[PDB]
């Protein structure tokens, strides 16, 4: 019954509801992704407006759409669930009908579509979410990293970040990542991510979670210690000067 056109054009040719959707993304926690030479890493910050949570149960920021693909986001959480679901369901459907898991690019193109659709369908508001999707195409070793936004647009990045202060960390990355020689190591790759997050996290050992993805469905999320260590080795790099 309800079909009010909520996303429409304004005189200057803008669709404010989609634009405002982005503002919701800017306010969200920061999320970053950097691809190495044989892996991709995704890092996300943990807000601190309230601390007394049960990190065990509380939903994490990086999700698995399938065994070889993960998706992190910045924006409204309630909205991210709906997108993550649709992605996961499509992941299975693609295996079932094409007898082959989805490619990172494909899963991305799907999500982007869902979002786009929500920007020109009656009675609905766009998703206040922007995503980072990374993994490895089936039987492939070249890492994949894509990003989507409420507008419904998407593209691949050698590294990228979304969320609050993403402006800052993007800069950091723009002047700390060389496509010529990408982080040839899982370790040096995670370091670059932790480094990039620190620029905005402001000492948050327990506020920074990292997830490493390797070829052939090898996905793992580091613990506070493994991370705390990276933070440690990094802080010295500064002082030793």
């Amino acid at each position: 019954g309800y079909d009010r056109a909520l996303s429409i054009f304004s005189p200057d040719g803008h669709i404010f509801q989609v634009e405002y959707a982005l503002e919701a993304v800017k306010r969200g926690t920061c999320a970053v992704g950097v691809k190495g030479k044989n892996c991709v890493v995704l890092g996300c910050e943990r807000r601190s407006t309230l601390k007394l949570q049960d990190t065990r149960i509380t939903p994490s920021k990086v999700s698995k759409i399938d065994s070889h693909v993960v998706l992190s986001f910045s924006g409204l959480n309630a909205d991210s669930r709906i997108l993550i679901e649709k992605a996961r369901v499509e992941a299975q459907s693609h295996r079932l009908t094409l007898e082959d898991p989805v490619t990172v690019e494909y899963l991305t193109r799907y999500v982007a579509g869902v979002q786009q659709r929500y920007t020109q369908s009656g009675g609905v508001r766009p998703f206040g979410v922007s995503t980072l999707i990374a993994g490895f195409d089936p039987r492939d070793d070249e890492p994949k990293l894509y990003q989507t936004e409420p507008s419904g647009i998407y593209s691949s990045w050698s590294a990228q970040t979304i969320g609050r202060n993403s402006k800052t960390v993007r800069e950091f990355l723009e002047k700390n990542y060389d496509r010529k020689e990408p982080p040839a190591t899982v370790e040096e790759c995670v370091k670059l991510t932790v480094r990039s997050l620190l620029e905005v996290v402001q000492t948050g050992a327990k506020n920074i979670e990292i997830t490493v993805v390797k070829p052939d469905s090898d996905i793992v999320a580091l613990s506070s210690e493994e991370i705390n260590q990276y933070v440690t080795q990094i802080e010295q790099e500064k002082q030793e000067q």
């Binding site: 759409i65 399938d66 996961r88 992941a91 299975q92 079932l96």
Partner: protein, 198 residues
């Protein structure tokens, strides 16, 4: 019908399934694997109508894997079978029912015990030490009813199967081209590639 056998020994569940695919007068294939893995510790064997058979199995698989990803957890064999029964039970009163029968064998990582479930297209579910769908039941239940022990090792179980398969080849009308055997246990699912003479 085709041969769908299942026997639960001490620490694993063994599933045997005929490799023959006959269409009318000709045997089209002799290497058919009538099984689908629902999760790392749950295997399901199936037999029935031409299309319904796989269509149903894959469908069930898709849904089980989706639950795995969504919950980052593997549903117990018991749960998985309850899902399956519900589905068939719905199917039976639908416009065009799935005519498939299945055996579900999995290792409950929590209880640390193997399990075997037998479910027919009507949604009839029963858990048994050993079971089979179709005619095989008529020649094998007496064998197992005789030589079956709960504490049998996986090897004893295989031998017991070897015994069933022989009887089936001796007294059965059809040439089912042998069976493919698979074992489910604490370490997952694996296929005994050497049963064509074990």
């Amino acid at each position: 019908m085709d041969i769908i056998l299942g026997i639960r020994v001490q620490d694993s569940v063994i599933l045997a399934s005929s490799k023959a695919v006959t269409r009318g007068i000709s045997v089209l294939k002799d290497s058919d694997d009538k099984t689908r893995q629902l999760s790392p510790h749950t295997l399901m064997s199936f037999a029935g109508e031409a299309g319904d058979t796989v269509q149903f199995a894959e469908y069930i698989q898709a849904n089980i894997q989706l639950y795995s990803i969504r919950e980052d957890y593997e549903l117990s064999p018991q749960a998985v079978s309850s899902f399956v029964r519900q589905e068939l039970a719905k199917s039976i009163r639908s416009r065009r029912p799935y005519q498939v029968n299945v055996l579900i064998g999995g290792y409950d990582k929590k209880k640390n015990k193997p399990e075997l479930y037998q479910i027919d297209y009507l949604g009839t579910k029963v858990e048994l030490p050993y079971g089979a769908h179709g005619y095989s039941g008529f020649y094998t239940f007496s064998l197992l009813d005789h030589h079956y022990r709960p504490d049998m090792t996986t090897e004893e179980g295989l031998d017991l199967l070897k015994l069933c398969v022989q009887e089936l080849e001796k007294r059965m009308p059809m040439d089912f081209k042998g069976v493919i055997v698979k074992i489910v246990d604490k370490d997952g699912i694996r296929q005994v590639d050497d049963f064509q003479a074990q």
